[PDB]
RNA sequence: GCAAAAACA
């Protein structure tokens, strides 16, 4: 570790990029996710009260609590209704143009949104086939079910889909087409069911995490509320989505004042939030801006569905007799999760208060943003998921103490519970950290979580090369990489590109060029590279005829539209197989 | 719109109604909170105690050597090695029985006859775990006793190995060859030429080192093993590890044998039998390896055989191990630009003295040797990437930031129940390099004036 | 992660699913090209690159359009 | 034997 800490000619901030486990196998989760899902469900019930009483918190249908019951020495799950009201009003006081623009959204082109683009979603779980299926076929199955049960065609607008769902769920007995029947209780159970799955390619912590995905019949509501979150977050300076860190650190405070920086993370950011506070926030803002009652229902239904979640418990806990191993579901044999046994509903489990990954990453940010808005909190705050940075400008240290203490209390009011061991406060400002960006003095260092692949994507040579070049250009533009690193990365990418397409060594393709007297002319064919460091956005066939390395006859041969095989700025060619 | 049963159906699991209209007056309550605290002594990373953690990786690392063979193809070199050598066992391990050498000699011969894939033999049975799942399941069923209880898995805590510093200093051995061959790109402008010159100078300041040869060997081995994974087989495949020095000769690092590897998903473990050339043997460092004596042209070598099994993800990741060269160069590049920022006159032959804490003493050292240090440690971290590594490293970034802040004379504040040392400690169990970094951080001074 | 399969896909027998064509021979100089949609070998695009049908120069210029303008702005500027 | 939360073999 001492090797990573310089003292002369360079500061540790720049070399802190070395504090990353690059070029290594990312952890992959094995076996059952039941223990992780059960722990995720049980954490919020263990922090509602100062004294841990899981059973007493199982009957709580609303995270409303009292300030005396909030735990200041540990995680606290729940919220205070009056606190949420006042903080929402305070946030409503400021950021008027963003609210006016979301009013424009709701009154102009929110109904213009369709449901076909919902096909661009993540993997779904079909409630007819009981299997994980891709989004497009799930959408087609859903629209077929809707049209065969509602006795009318579903309109292209997403609001037509919303009304279609609302009407079809009131038809009691339903059937798909086989001839898979359903009931009202079955439809409600499908609404309540959440599909948990191991998070793949996750780096940054020892313990793996489970992300949830919802049914396709609620994804419309969740995506419209997330969209509203997007167009309220894009036009607020205190959000974490844009260069906000640099422009905020560009502050030049006067000498007779003290400025300090807090960089913090969150403990159990998805195990201390109740959706009811989110409901109250959305309802208060929409009512005070002027939305009607049908908009109230439209923007409050997703939390209605989420408050009754039935996230699957994986495949069951692990039990060993001797050297044997078996997956026994919860409740079959006593375990450390006995308190939740009464909440088991078939293969699922009821969890009134809680949160899961992959559901709401921006409206939780909105809750944090309304929480930070107070009167004595005269600082600048940037939030993104479970990471935050705050800048305090004041005159004396105890003012910093009280401001930071009341900030922590306000975040705990709605159930954020910033990490005591991951929040670092430096009373003189200048060196901060947020997301993946560091900041020393005035310079800011962007660090990529993942290095560039430096490998063709596998579609076809020219498109893969274009994507690799664009990735290198994006990496170098953001400051994550520089001249030497960019050139080394493009050399490595060139080597991988040549090897993957049998452009190196002796092989069948090389023998094909050799016997047929076909000299190489392109990079994939085996010719010398033509792309330089400054040539990141230039086409493969370009810069070759301009330099005279390609004759127009072979260009006509390859660029002929009548060829049996035919942002990506790749010209069509015969090699685009 | 709202339905009839819709309304109550939504009611059942919420105290409030669908559209919430609370009657409480909006206000901010005042809550007594704990005291902001400030720290003097930097946290001391606790050191796990117990047996030293042995070496575990795809290949050997610093103990990787090669046999010099006359110029020719892979088959000629394999035939020369097989026909001009005899094998006798020196060290026997229960994890890798001696009989698996019969497998290796079965492949060295077979590959010498134009058959990279050969039929199965009896010694292959206990070489790749063939029918091992059925064996274990039937044995457990026959010996099952007691009553079902919770799994309660645990990981043993193991101390810092004594061989970490020898690894860290042996990867830096000077080599007569560059060991890096990257095709030069074209140059059209001055900045592109400067970048190419920087990458060059990087190549011949970190190329003639043992770590570069080890990275090349890892890349070749992983690439050859991965190239034979997709094709589902039931017969043993041979993937020799031979490189070419810039004199025409052949360099035999070792040979990996791939079993039946009936892979289904993307994370299944294909079995492997890896034979490699060693420079020296150590008991507690390679407890699961079998060591044989190798005689080639009255020349002594040690052959290490290990039975292992790795997933396609890990093999593919190590097939692109060369990317590890990116991280150190950046520093060097930045340092060069730093000198440019000093005078706006780039040199390309700058070797500034970097000051570091070595054995508890603040002393300077050359930039090139420091870059070699960085490349070796990055390679060691990359080949030992486990969730403990990533968790410890991510939680240690904060302590590194705090230490830098104290170096540049600023105060750091912590909450009441703030113990970052625990959130850095829980990831320190048995990883050798994690413990090495913990010891290095602890050796540095903890109080700064 | 499709990039993990390209290594097989390039080495896969008959990598390319060919649109049925006639000007491409079945076997050229002791080497199968197509699988008589039908499949084709990796050497077929290279065969087309030298012994394939050409087209009008205006068509080539139109196809290469929107990709040159960057080239003659990069090679006509002074650093 | 490989991993790391029972997976592959």
The secondary structure of C12-67 as a DSSP string is SSS-EEEPP-SSS-SBSSS-B-B---EEE-THHHHHHHHHS----HHHHHHHHTTT
Round to a whole number and report the distance in Å from the CA of B106 to the C1' of D6. Answer: 35
Residue B226 to residue C7, Cβ atoms within 8 A: yes
The structure tokens 């009464």 sit at: A342
Is residue A233 packed enough to be buried (19+ CB in 10 Å), middle (13-18) or exposed (0-12)?
buried
Round to a whole number and report the distance in Å from the CA of A43 to the C1' of D7. Answer: 26
What the block records as the tokens of B435 is 């413990």
In our burial notation (b when 16+ CB lie closer than 10 A, e otherwise), range B342-366 reads eeeeeeeebebebebbeeeeeeeee
What the block records as the tokens of B77 is 């070199």
Cα A458 to Cα C1, C6, C46: the distances in Å are 9, 5, 18
Kindly report the backbone phi and psi dihedral angles of residue A318, in degrees, each rounded to the nearest multiple of 5, phi listed first.
-105, 125
Strand D and B413 CB separated by under 7 Å: no
Contact A89, A215 (CB under 8 A): no
Please count the other Cβ atoms lying within 10 Å of the Cβ belonging to residue A84. Answer: 28
Terminal-residue alpha carbon distance, chain C? 41
Q: CA of B294, closest CA in chain A: separation in Å?
A: 30
Cα A371 to Cα A79, A156, A281: the distances in Å are 11, 38, 10
3-state secondary structure of A90: helix
CA B128 from chain center: how many Å? Answer: 23
Side-chain half-sphere of C26: how many Cα atoms within 13 Å? 2
Terminal-residue alpha carbon distance, chain B? 69
Q: How many residues make up chain C in this entry?
A: 79
Task: Tell which residue, A537, A526, C79, has the closest CA to residue B193.
Answer: C79
Measured distance CA(B255)–CA(A162) in Å, rounded? 62
The structure tokens 């087409």 sit at: A177
Going by C-beta distance under 8 Å and a sequence separation of 6 or more, which residues neighbour residue C41? C13, C14, C15, C16, C31, C32, C33, C34
Measured distance CA(B327)–CA(A488) in Å, rounded? 10
- Which contiguous run of DSSP H or E holds residue A57? helix A54-58
What the block records as the tokens of A385 is 């998921």
Query: Residue A194 carries which DSSP code?
Result: -
Contact A204, B393 (CB under 8 A): no
CA dihedral sign, ordered B210, B214, B217, B219: negative
The protein footprint on chain D, as nucleotides within 7 A of a CB, is: 1-9
What the block records as the tokens of A520 is 């190489």
Candidates B2, B13, B373; nearest CB to A307:
B13
- Which contiguous run of DSSP H or E holds residue A444? strand A443-446
Strand D and B397 CB separated by under 7 Å: no
What the block records as the tokens of A214 is 């919802």
Is residue A119 packed enough to be buried (19+ CB in 10 Å), middle (13-18) or exposed (0-12)?
middle
Residue C4 to residue B266, Cβ atoms within 8 A: yes
Going by C-beta distance under 8 Å and a sequence separation of 6 or more, which residues neighbour residue A60? A48, A352, A353
Q: From its phi and psi, is residue A215 left (phi > 0), alpha (psi between -120 and 50) or beta?
A: beta
Round to a whole number and report the distance in Å from the CA of A205 to the C1' of D2. Answer: 22
Is residue C39 packed enough to be buried (19+ CB in 10 Å), middle (13-18) or exposed (0-12)?
middle
Going by C-beta distance under 8 Å and a sequence separation of 6 or more, which residues neighbour residue B343? none
The nucleotide minimizing the C1' distance to residue A34's CA is: D5
Measured distance CA(B222)–CA(B383) in Å, rounded? 12
Task: Tell which residue, B237, B279, B227, B274, has the closest CA to residue B258.
Answer: B237
In our burial notation (b when 16+ CB lie closer than 10 A, e otherwise), range A442-468 reads eebbbbbeebbbbbbbbbbbbbbbbbb
3-state SS of B97-125 is: CCCHHHHHHHHHHHHHCCCCEECCCHHHH
Round to a whole number and report the distance in Å from the CA of A30 to the C1' of D7. Answer: 5
What the block records as the tokens of A408 is 């922590």
Angle, to 10 degrees, between the axis of helix B210-226 and the axis of helix B367-383? 30
At residue A137's C-alpha, the angle toward residues A133 and A141, to 5°, is 105
Q: What is the resolution of this structure in A?
A: 2.7
Neighboring chains of C (3 or more beta-carbon pairs < 8 A): A, B
Is residue B236 packed enough to be buried (19+ CB in 10 Å), middle (13-18) or exposed (0-12)?
buried
CA dihedral sign, ordered B286, A1, A390, A481: negative
| Order of strands, sheet of B149-150, starting from the edge strand that comes earlier in the sequence | A326-328, A317-320, B149-150
**Please, which residues 314-343 of chain B have a Cβ atom closer than 8 Å to chain C?**
316
CA A273 from chain center: how many Å? Answer: 17
Going by C-beta distance under 8 Å and a sequence separation of 6 or more, which residues neighbour residue B149? A319, A320, A321
What the block records as the tokens of A577 is 């197989």
3-state SS of chain B is: CCCHHHHHHHHCCCCCCCCCCCCCCCCCCCCCCCCCEECCCCCCCCCCCCCECCCCCCCCCCCCECEEECCCCHHHHHHHHHHCCCEEEEECCCCCCCCHHHHHHHHHHHHHCCCCEECCCHHHHHHCCCCHHHHHHHHHHHCCCCCCEECCCCCCCCECCCCHHHHHHHCCCECCCCCCCCCCCCCCCHHHHHHHHHHHHHHHHHCCEHHHHHHHHHHHHHHHHHCCCCCCCCCEEEEEEEEECCCCCEEEEEEEEECCCCCCCCCCEEEEEEEEEECCCCCCCCCCCEEEEEEECCEEEEEEEEEEEEEHHHHHHHHCHHHHHHHHHHHHHHHHHHHHHHHCCCCCCCCCEEEEEECCEEEEEEHHHHHHHHHHHHHHHHHCCCHHHHHHHHHHHHHHHHHHHHHCCCCEEECCCCCHHHHHHCCCCCCHHHHHHHHHHHHCCCCCC
Q: Which residues of A touch B343 (CB under 8 A)?
A: none
Q: How many residues make up chain B in this entry?
A: 449
């Amino acid at each position: 570790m001492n090797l990573f800490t310089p003292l002369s000619e360079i500061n540790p901030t720049t070399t802190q990029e070395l504090l990353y486990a690059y070029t290594g196998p990312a952890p992959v989760a094995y076996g059952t996710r039941t223990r992780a899902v059960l722990e995720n469900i049980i954490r919020p019930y263990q922090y509602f009260y100062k004294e841990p009483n899981v059973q007493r918190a199982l009957d709580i249908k609303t995270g409303c609590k009292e300030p005396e019951d909030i735990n200041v020495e540990g995680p606290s799950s729940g919220f205070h209704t009056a606190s949420v009201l006042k903080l929402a009003d305070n946030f409503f006081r400021k950021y008027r143009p963003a609210m006016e623009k979301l009013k424009y959204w709701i009154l102009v082109k929110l109904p213009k949104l369709k449901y076909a683009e919902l096909s661009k979603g993540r993997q779904t779980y079909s409630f007819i086939h009981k299997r994980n299926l891709p989004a497009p076929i799930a959408l087609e199955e859903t629209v077929e079910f809707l049209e065969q049960n509602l006795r009318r065609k579903i309109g292209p607008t997403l609001l037509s889909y919303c009304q279609a769902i609302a009407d079809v769920m009131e038809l009691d007995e339903t059937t798909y087409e086989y001839t898979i029947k359903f009931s009202r209780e079955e439809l409600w159970d499908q609404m309540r069911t959440l599909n948990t799955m191991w998070k793949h390619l996750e780096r940054g912590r020892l313990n793996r995490r489970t992300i949830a995905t919802p049914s396709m019949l609620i994804r419309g509501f969740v995506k419209i509320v997330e969209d509203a979150a997007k167009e309220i977050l894009e036009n607020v300076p205190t959000s974490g989505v844009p260069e906000k860190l640099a422009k905020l650190a560009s502050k030049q405070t006067f000498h007779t004042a003290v400025t300090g920086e807090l960089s913090g993370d969150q403990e159990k950011f998805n195990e201390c939030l109740d959706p009811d506070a989110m409901r109250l926030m959305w309802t208060v803002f929409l009512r005070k801006l002027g939305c009607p009652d049908w908009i109230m229902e439209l923007f409050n239904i997703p939390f209605m569905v989420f408050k009754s979640k039935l996230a699957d418990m994986g495949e069951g806990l692990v039990y060993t007799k001797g050297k044997l191993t078996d997956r026994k579901p919860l409740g079959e044999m006593p375990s450390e999760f006995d308190d939740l046994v009464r909440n088991v509903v078939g293969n699922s489990i009821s969890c009134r208060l809680g949160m899961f990954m992959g559901m709401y990453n921006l409206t939780s940010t909105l809750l944090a943003l309304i929480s930070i808005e107070r009167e004595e909190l005269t600082g600048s705050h940037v939030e993104s998921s479970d990471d935050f940075i705050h800048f305090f400008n004041c005159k004396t240290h105890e003012e910093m103490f009280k401001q930071a203490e009341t900030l922590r209390l306000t975040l705990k009011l709605v159930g954020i519970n910033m990490s005591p061991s991951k929040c670092i406060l430096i009373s003189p400002a200048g060196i901060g950290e947020f997301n993946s960006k560091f900041h020393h003095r005035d310079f800011v260092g962007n660090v990529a979580t993942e290095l560039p692949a430096l490998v063709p994507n596998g579609t076809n040579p020219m498109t893969d090369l274009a994507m690799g070049l664009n990735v290198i250009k994006h990496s170098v533009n953001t400051g994550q990489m520089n001249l030497c690193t960019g050139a080394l990365a493009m050399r490595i990418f060139n080597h991988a590109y040549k090897y993957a397409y049998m452009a190196l060594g002796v092989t069948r393709r090389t023998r094909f060029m050799e016997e047929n007297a076909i000299t190489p002319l392109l990079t994939n064919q085996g010719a010398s590279p033509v792309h330089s460091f400054s040539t990141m956005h230039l086409d493969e066939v370009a810069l070759r005829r301009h330099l005279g390395l390609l004759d127009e006859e072979t260009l006509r041969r390859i660029l002929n539209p009548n060829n049996p095989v035919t942002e990506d700025y790749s010209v069509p060619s015969c090699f685009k197989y | 719109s709202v339905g009839t049963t819709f309304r109550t159906l939504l009611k059942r699991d919420t105290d409030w109604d669908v559209i919430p209209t609370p009657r409480v007056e909006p206000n901010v309550p005042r809550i007594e909170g704990r005291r902001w605290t400030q720290m003097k002594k930097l946290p001391l990373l606790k050191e796990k105690e117990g047996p030293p953690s042995p070496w575990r990786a795809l290949l050997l690392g610093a103990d990787s050597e090669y046999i010099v063979c006359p110029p020719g193809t892979d088959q000629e070199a394999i035939s020369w090695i097989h026909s001009q050598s005899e094998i006798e066992c020196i060290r026997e391990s229960k994890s890798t029985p001696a009989s698996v050498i019969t497998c290796l000699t079965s492949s060295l011969q077979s590959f010498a006859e134009g058959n990279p894939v050969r039929s199965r033999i009896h010694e292959d049975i206990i070489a790749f775990g063939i029918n091992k799942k059925q064996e274990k399941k039937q044995s457990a069923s026959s010996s099952a006793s007691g009553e079902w209880k919770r799994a309660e898995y645990q990981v043993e805590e193991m101390s810092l190995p004594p061989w970490v510093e020898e690894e860290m200093v042996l990867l830096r051995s000077d080599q007569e060859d560059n060991w890096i061959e990257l095709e030069k790109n074209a140059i059209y402008t001055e900045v592109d030429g400067v970048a190419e010159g920087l990458v060059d100078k990087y190549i011949e300041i970190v190329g003639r080192t043992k770590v570069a040869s080890v990275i090349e060997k890892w890349q070749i081995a992983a690439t050859r093993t991965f190239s034979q994974l997709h094709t589902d087989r039931s017969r043993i495949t041979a993937c020799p590890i031979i490189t070419r020095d810039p004199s025409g000769n052949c360099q035999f690092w070792g040979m990996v044998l791939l079993g039946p590897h009936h892979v289904k998903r993307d994370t299944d473990n294909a079995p492997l039998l890896i034979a490699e050339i060693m420079g020296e043997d150590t008991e507690e460092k390679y407890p699961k390896h079998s060591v044989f004596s190798l005689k080639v042209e009255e020349k002594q070598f040690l052959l290490s055989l290990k039975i292992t099994s790795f997933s396609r993800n890990k093999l593919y990741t190590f097939s692109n191990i060369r990317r590890v060269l990116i991280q150190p160069a950046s520093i060097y590049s930045q340092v060069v630009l730093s000198r440019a920022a000093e005078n706006n006159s780039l040199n390309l032959e700058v070797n500034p003295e970097i000051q570091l804490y070595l054995e508890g003493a603040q002393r300077g050292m050359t930039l090139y040797q420091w870059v070699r240090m960085i490349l070796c440690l990055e390679f060691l971290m990359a080949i030992y990437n486990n969730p403990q590594m990533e968790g410890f490293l991510a939680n240690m970034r904060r302590l590194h930031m705090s230490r830098h802040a104290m170096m540049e004379r600023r105060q750091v504040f912590l909450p009441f129940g703030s113990r970052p040392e625990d959130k850095v400690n829980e990831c320190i169990i048995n990883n050798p390099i994690v413990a090495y970094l913990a010891k290095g951080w602890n050796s540095m001074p903890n109080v700064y004036y | 992660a499709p990039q993990m399969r390209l290594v097989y896909s390039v080495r896969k027998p008959w990598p390319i699913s060919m649109t049925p064509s006639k000007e491409i021979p079945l076997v050229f100089n002791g080497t199968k090209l197509k699988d008589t949609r039908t499949r084709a070998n990796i050497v077929v695009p290279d065969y087309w690159s030298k012994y394939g049908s050409q087209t009008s120069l205006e068509v080539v210029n139109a196809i290469l359009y929107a990709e040159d303008l960057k080239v003659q702005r990069f090679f006509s500027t002074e650093w």
